[PDB]
Ligand binder design. Structure first.
Ligand SMILES: *[C@@H]1O[C@H](CO)[C@@H](O[C@@H]2O[C@H](CO)[C@@H](O)[C@H](O)[C@H]2NC(C)=O)[C@H](O)[C@H]1NC(C)=O
Ligand SMILES: *[C@@H]1O[C@H](CO)[C@@H](O[C@@H]2O[C@H](CO)[C@@H](O)[C@H](O)[C@H]2NC(C)=O)[C@H](O)[C@H]1NC(C)=O
Lengths: 48, 48
């Protein structure tokens, strides 16, 4: 809930990060929409 | 004149409701506008 730059596992981006109701399968790490733009990420330590 | 008119208004509900595709003239511009925003964004992936 802050504007931050980020790097997750080498994936670099920017935005407001927040808790998600979505559920990736155990082997997906980054979400991409229709636009092929990165809308969500699994945190590599809390795994949420 | 009233009963023909009531039966005539009657079918105008049904042509929309039963989905005769006639709203295509609006749908097709909502699609044609959207396909351009999708196209515009997607080119940012290209190496040029
Ligand atoms: C990395 O380490 C942290 C803690 O050192 C792990 O977080 C713990 O996860 C368990 C199970 O969910 C919780 O019961 C603990 O409360 C968590 N720790 C803390 C300090 O709250 C985390 O799971 C580890 N990551 C991996 C991938 O193993
Ligand atoms: C003119 O056409 C109308 C149809 O729009 C006729 O009205 C029908 O009349 C029959 C009996 O002959 C009724 O069973 C139908 O229910 C009527 N239809 C409607 C929509 O009400 C009318 O009889 C015709 N009259 C002439 C003189 O041709």
């Amino acid at each position: 809930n802050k504007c931050v730059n980020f790097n997750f596992n080498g994936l670099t981006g920017t935005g407001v990060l927040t808790e998600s109701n979505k559920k990736f399968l155990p082997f997906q790490q980054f979400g991409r929409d229709i636009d092929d733009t990165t809308d969500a990420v699994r945190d590599p330590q809390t795994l949420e | 004149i009233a009963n023909q008119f009531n039966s005539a208004i009657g079918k105008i509900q049904d042509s929309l409701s039963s989905t005769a595709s006639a709203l295509g003239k609006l749908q097709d511009v909502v699609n044609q506008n959207a396909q351009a925003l999708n196209t515009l964004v997607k080119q940012l992936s290209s190496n040029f």
